[PDB]
Design a protein around this ligand. Structure first.
Ligand SMILES: Cc1ccc(C2CC2)c(-c2ccc3c(c2)CCCO3)c1[C@H](OC1CC1)C(=O)O
Ligand SMILES: Cc1ccc(C2CC2)c(-c2ccc3c(c2)CCCO3)c1[C@H](OC1CC1)C(=O)O
Ligand SMILES: [Cl-]
Ligand SMILES: [Mg+2]
Ligand SMILES: [Mg+2]
Lengths: 50, 140, 142, 45
């Protein structure tokens, strides 16, 4: 439903699983690694086309 | 299938031409992009997906097609990615461009003239532009 | 008529958005052009004419629409030019969808195409993208 | 079969194509016989 794309490296990483959305950061899981990414450096894109 | 497309890049005069073909009809769309990047490729797909029911896109392993930006566009638009119709179409497009090249200053103008000529030509009888509209309307 | 279109330019973030609407269906196509000139307008029409059976285009008296470059493009593609409500109402509708999704993308051109996608895929059920394909295919098959 | 040209950066035309040379084109615009260089002419079929 939701997929998160992020930057750590200007190359955009992802897609990652959305674990939690905070007011200043998002918690994601890329592969087996849990990452905390600020809101400004993340893109939570929904499968709108469906 | 009415929703399968093939995309690939061809080159003329040092410029990058991104071509999309509707496999079931031969209908084509092309655009000269300033760089062969995932950002330009994803923007091309977003425009295409808003015009036609794009369900599956078949490309080679080009770095612009496997880029993260394209994956995000296909995910948002609900497009599935899979990795000789498009190759035969690039040569067909290149041939019409060479026949009309001297009629325009810019290559991008000749490209769209060639896309116009290809999509409007009947077999001998429907054109590729008529077939894709026919195939999609029947699917509705 | 299945071949009547309306074209007009709107502005957001200092950028020029050229919009084309299929009157009989409400289907839209938009593009952010680097300049509001006849050359950019003619190139847009050449892409549109290779896409749909464009027979008549209705515009205002903007200098880009009355330019010689656009007249040359309309002649080559066999397009008749005529010089309101539909495109004016569609510029506001497009701007409304862009404002709802603007923060989802860095570039304005990404938001315009997301809004074009949203507008053409929204049903009522019949969506605008389904209507133009249905209207044009009915003219072909009959 | 149609010639657009520049005499003024505004493109003039359409004019009738009479002859296409390697460095110039002979055209008729309105009732005038004009001769225009190749670089300042658009010969569209
Ligand atoms: C730059 C330029 C300047 C003047 C004109 C015309 C005669 C005034 C054109 C032009 C327009 C339409 C057209 C053709 C040429 C040739 C065949 C298809 O229809 C162009 C054209 O680019 C513009 C984006 C289309 C180009 O690439 O030459
Ligand atoms: C510049 C940039 C960088 C990274 C990405 C993505 C994160 C991988 C995207 C992007 C691509 C597709 C997409 C979205 C964003 C959001 C919703 C619709 O689908 C863009 C995008 O521009 C690209 C020409 C579309 C923009 O304007 O933000
Ligand atoms: Cl937080
Ligand atoms: Mg390739
Ligand atoms: Mg206007």
């Amino acid at each position: 439903n939701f997929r998160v794309y992020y930057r750590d490296d200007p190359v955009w990483k992802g897609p990652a699983k959305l674990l939690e959305k905070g007011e200043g950061a998002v918690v994601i899981q890329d592969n087996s690694d849990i990452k905390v990414v600020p809101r400004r450096k993340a893109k939570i894109i929904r499968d709108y086309g469906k």
